[PDB]
Design a protein around this ligand. Structure first.
Ligand SMILES: CC(=O)N[C@H]1[C@H]([C@H](O)[C@H](O)CO)O[C@@](O[C@@H]2[C@@H](O)[C@H](O)O[C@H](CO)[C@@H]2O)(C(=O)O)C[C@@H]1O
Ligand SMILES: [Cl-]
Length: 227
């Protein structure tokens, strides 16, 4: 038991994608006849002219190892935010199936199960003030030690880096989507908001009596135990 996100929403999406690829193969779509290990859900551009971000089922053998632009893939955290993860879309050769409605719907279901009400408030404060940002306690520009609560632009985060977030008791937790504190242009795309985020976090109602002890969990609700 790590005090860390289980990435359950992403996990559902990949599984649902594996099912869809299997169905398509049964329908004769030869390129979709692959083992499960080869299919994931990414939120990304598609082939040329498929220029918006959509949930699609990708064959990982058709993914590039890195991106240039505007072709990076995104994964999703347990609050429903899409965050860069490794890989890139080959705009001519991608093997995928766009499944935007089914996959979006599973995200919305997964948000009710898995998203910490304390993290949701931290994210709401961030999005209200700086549209498209979410809250982490992580690194800033050109400094790989110091952490602070900030509103980060999602494109500047890395899914494969875990960074501090709020658990569903408003305590220390770690979530995919963090910073390395390197010195790139993306490493500047955040707004430090220690007081605002902390007060957003502080303003959420406890899921436990003032007399119970809240033990966080990677799914809602947390454990409440008598003091
Ligand atoms: C350029 C950008 O997107 N973000 C800046 C950010 C913003 O300017 C924002 O207004 C911060 O709320 O500013 C950052 O640095 C800040 C300093 O400019 C300020 O004097 O001290 C602040 C300490 O809380 C803060 O460090 C930021 O918020 O982190 C740098 C960031 O790249
Ligand atoms: Cl998360």
């Amino acid at each position: 038991h790590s005090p860390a996100s289980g990435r359950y929403i992403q996990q559902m999406l990949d599984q649902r994608c594996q099912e869809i690829a299997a169905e398509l193969c049964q329908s004769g779509l030869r390129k979709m006849c692959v083992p499960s290990s080869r299919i994931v859900a990414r939120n990304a551009v598609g082939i040329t002219h498929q220029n918006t971000l959509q949930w699609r089922c990708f064959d990982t053998a058709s993914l590039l190892e890195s991106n240039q632009e505007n072709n990076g893939v995104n994964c999703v955290d347990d609050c429903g935010h899409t965050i860069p993860c490794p890989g890139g879309v080959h705009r001519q050769n991608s093997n995928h199936a766009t499944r935007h409605e089914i996959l979006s719907k599973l995200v919305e279901e997964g948000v009710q199960r898995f998203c910490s009400p304390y993290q949701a408030s931290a994210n709401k404060y961030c999005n209200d003030k700086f549209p498209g940002t979410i809250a982490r306690r992580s690194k800033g520009f050109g400094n790989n030690v110091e952490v602070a609560w900030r509103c980060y632009e999602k494109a500047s985060l890395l899914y494969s880096v875990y960074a501090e977030c709020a658990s569903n008791c408003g305590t220390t937790w770690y979530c995919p989507g963090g910073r390395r504190g390197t010195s790139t242009e993306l490493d500047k795309r955040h707004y430090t908001e220690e007081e605002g985020i902390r007060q957003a976090i502080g303003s959420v109602d406890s899921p436990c009596s003032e007399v119970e002890v809240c033990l966080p969990k990677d799914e809602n609700p947390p454990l409440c135990l008598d003091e």
